[PDB]
Each structure stands twice: as structure tokens, then as C-alpha cells.
Design an enzyme around this catalytic site. Sequence first.
Site, PDB file in Angstrom:
ATOM      1  N   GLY A   1       0.820  -1.196   0.000  1.00 58.52           N
ATOM      2  CA  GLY A   1       0.000   0.000   0.000  1.00 58.52           C
ATOM      3  C   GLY A   1       0.856   1.248   0.000  1.00 58.52           C
ATOM      4  O   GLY A   1       2.010   1.223   0.425  1.00 58.52           O
TER       5      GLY A   1
ATOM      6  N   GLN B   1       2.727  10.067   1.474  1.00 55.79           N
ATOM      7  CA  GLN B   1       4.052   9.472   1.599  1.00 55.79           C
ATOM      8  C   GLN B   1       5.032   9.894   0.513  1.00 55.79           C
ATOM      9  O   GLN B   1       6.245   9.776   0.694  1.00 55.79           O
ATOM     10  CB  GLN B   1       3.946   7.950   1.609  1.00 55.79           C
ATOM     11  CG  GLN B   1       3.299   7.386   2.852  1.00 55.79           C
ATOM     12  CD  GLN B   1       3.168   5.884   2.790  1.00 55.79           C
ATOM     13  OE1 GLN B   1       2.177   5.356   2.287  1.00 55.79           O
ATOM     14  NE2 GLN B   1       4.182   5.179   3.286  1.00 55.79           N
TER      15      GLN B   1
ATOM     16  N   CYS C   1       5.574  -0.154   7.136  1.00 54.30           N
ATOM     17  CA  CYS C   1       5.283   1.090   6.428  1.00 54.30           C
ATOM     18  C   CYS C   1       6.541   1.547   5.711  1.00 54.30           C
ATOM     19  O   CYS C   1       7.621   1.562   6.297  1.00 54.30           O
ATOM     20  CB  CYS C   1       4.837   2.171   7.417  1.00 54.30           C
ATOM     21  SG  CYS C   1       4.385   3.756   6.652  1.00 54.30           S
ATOM     22  N   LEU C   2       6.402   1.922   4.442  1.00 54.71           N
ATOM     23  CA  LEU C   2       7.554   2.374   3.673  1.00 54.71           C
ATOM     24  C   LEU C   2       8.134   3.678   4.206  1.00 54.71           C
ATOM     25  O   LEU C   2       9.258   4.044   3.859  1.00 54.71           O
ATOM     26  CB  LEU C   2       7.180   2.524   2.196  1.00 54.71           C
ATOM     27  CG  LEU C   2       6.816   1.210   1.495  1.00 54.71           C
ATOM     28  CD1 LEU C   2       6.352   1.492   0.074  1.00 54.71           C
ATOM     29  CD2 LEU C   2       8.025   0.273   1.500  1.00 54.71           C
TER      30      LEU C   2
ATOM     31  N   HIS D   1      -4.797   1.675   7.435  1.00 53.94           N
ATOM     32  CA  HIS D   1      -3.424   2.163   7.532  1.00 53.94           C
ATOM     33  C   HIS D   1      -3.225   3.300   6.528  1.00 53.94           C
ATOM     34  O   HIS D   1      -2.732   4.373   6.876  1.00 53.94           O
ATOM     35  CB  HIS D   1      -2.452   1.013   7.226  1.00 53.94           C
ATOM     36  CG  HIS D   1      -1.008   1.416   7.174  1.00 53.94           C
ATOM     37  ND1 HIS D   1      -0.063   0.918   8.045  1.00 53.94           N
ATOM     38  CD2 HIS D   1      -0.337   2.231   6.321  1.00 53.94           C
ATOM     39  CE1 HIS D   1       1.124   1.406   7.734  1.00 53.94           C
ATOM     40  NE2 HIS D   1       0.987   2.203   6.692  1.00 53.94           N
ATOM     41  N   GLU D   2      -3.623   3.059   5.283  1.00 56.88           N
ATOM     42  CA  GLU D   2      -3.463   4.062   4.238  1.00 56.88           C
ATOM     43  C   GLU D   2      -4.308   5.307   4.483  1.00 56.88           C
ATOM     44  O   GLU D   2      -3.854   6.426   4.243  1.00 56.88           O
ATOM     45  CB  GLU D   2      -3.801   3.470   2.867  1.00 56.88           C
ATOM     46  CG  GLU D   2      -2.900   2.314   2.435  1.00 56.88           C
ATOM     47  CD  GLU D   2      -1.425   2.572   2.695  1.00 56.88           C
ATOM     48  OE1 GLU D   2      -0.979   3.735   2.612  1.00 56.88           O
ATOM     49  OE2 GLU D   2      -0.698   1.595   2.974  1.00 56.88           O
TER      50      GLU D   2
ATOM     51  N   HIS E   1      -2.685   7.707   6.832  1.00 61.24           N
ATOM     52  CA  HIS E   1      -1.663   8.562   6.226  1.00 61.24           C
ATOM     53  C   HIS E   1      -2.255   9.866   5.710  1.00 61.24           C
ATOM     54  O   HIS E   1      -1.639  10.928   5.826  1.00 61.24           O
ATOM     55  CB  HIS E   1      -0.975   7.855   5.047  1.00 61.24           C
ATOM     56  CG  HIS E   1       0.132   6.927   5.448  1.00 61.24           C
ATOM     57  ND1 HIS E   1       1.236   7.346   6.155  1.00 61.24           N
ATOM     58  CD2 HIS E   1       0.318   5.607   5.206  1.00 61.24           C
ATOM     59  CE1 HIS E   1       2.058   6.326   6.335  1.00 61.24           C
ATOM     60  NE2 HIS E   1       1.520   5.257   5.766  1.00 61.24           N
TER      61      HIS E   1
END
EC number: 3.5.1.88
Length: 166
Positions: A45, A50, A90-91, A132-133, A136
Site C-alpha cells: 500500500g 508518503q 510502512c515504507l 493504515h493508508e 496517512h
Amino acid sequence: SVLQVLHIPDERLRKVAKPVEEVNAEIQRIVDDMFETMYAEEGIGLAATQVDIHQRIIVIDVSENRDERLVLINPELLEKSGETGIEEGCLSIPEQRALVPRAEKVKIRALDRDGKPFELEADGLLAICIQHEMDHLVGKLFMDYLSPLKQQRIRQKVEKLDRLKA
Ligand SMILES: OCN(O)CCCc1ccccc1
Ligand code: NI
């Protein structure tokens, strides 16, 4: 194109995304670059926030073969139920994973890559990823649900990683 993914403790990760005004060619290029970035970084994702694009755009792929693209533009939470938790990654918080509380199931409505509205009922990993997304997009990270000690440890590990990378 592949975009650079912001890493903590970047304050830009705290910016609240604005809704996408129209799903046009510009937005579609962003969506495609986000998928390319997500796949290149081996994530499931990615939120526009991000990559320093503050609009409500999310790309996801939870498939085993990595060939099932899901696009959530202007996602809206309609209903949610239950509780669950898995060790999330998470990236923007490279190589760190921690369990955080999430609803078990969610129902959302959003616009697809073509701008067509759709509703989606999800559970399991997909439901968790969606939450989660969406976090962000409102400037929230999974580490925010952890203790100050846990957060400090994560912070130091990420900074060390980027230190080595540089
Ligand atoms: O923002 C997402 N990202 O950088 C990639 C990984 C997302 C994710 C990974 C494990 C469990 C839930 C969500
Ligand atoms: Ni993330």
C-alpha cells in the site's frame, strides 16, 4: 516514474490531504507512479502523502502474485466493526513492524482510477491496509499508537538506516 518515499521524522508526513477535485490525466499519472513506487519498494500500500502529494489518493495490492491493483481516491469510511491487529510495516518507517489496533471489517466508498464511484466491503489484510493508508491521509502513522519508548526506538532505528544509506 518512481517517487521518493518520505521517512520519519519528516513533518510533511503530518500534512492532511485535500480531496481530489477531478480524476484526470494528471491524477492518473500520479496513481501510476505511486503503483510503480509501491512495487519497487515491495509494499502492499502507498498513500499520496508518503510521496509528498497531499491529495486523497491511495494505491493498494494485497495479492500474492502482486497483480491486483486497487485504487482508492477520496475514500470515505461508511461502516466498521470488530477489532484486530497484525504486525504492520510502512515504507515511511523502513524495516520496522509493530502491531496496532484496527477495526476488523470496513465498508468504504471511493473513486477508482477512472473516477467511477464504487463501494467496497473488506476484512482481513485488506481492511487493515485500507485503514493504515487512510491514516496517512490525515497525517497519522502506525507508530503513533505505540508507547513513547517504542516510538523512540523506532525513530532511532530508521534514522540509523538512512544514515547508512547516505
Ligand atoms: O503506507 C504503506 N506502506 O508504505 C506499505 C505497507 C503497508 C502495510 C504493511 C503491513 C500491514 C498493513 C499495511
Ligand atoms: Ni504506511
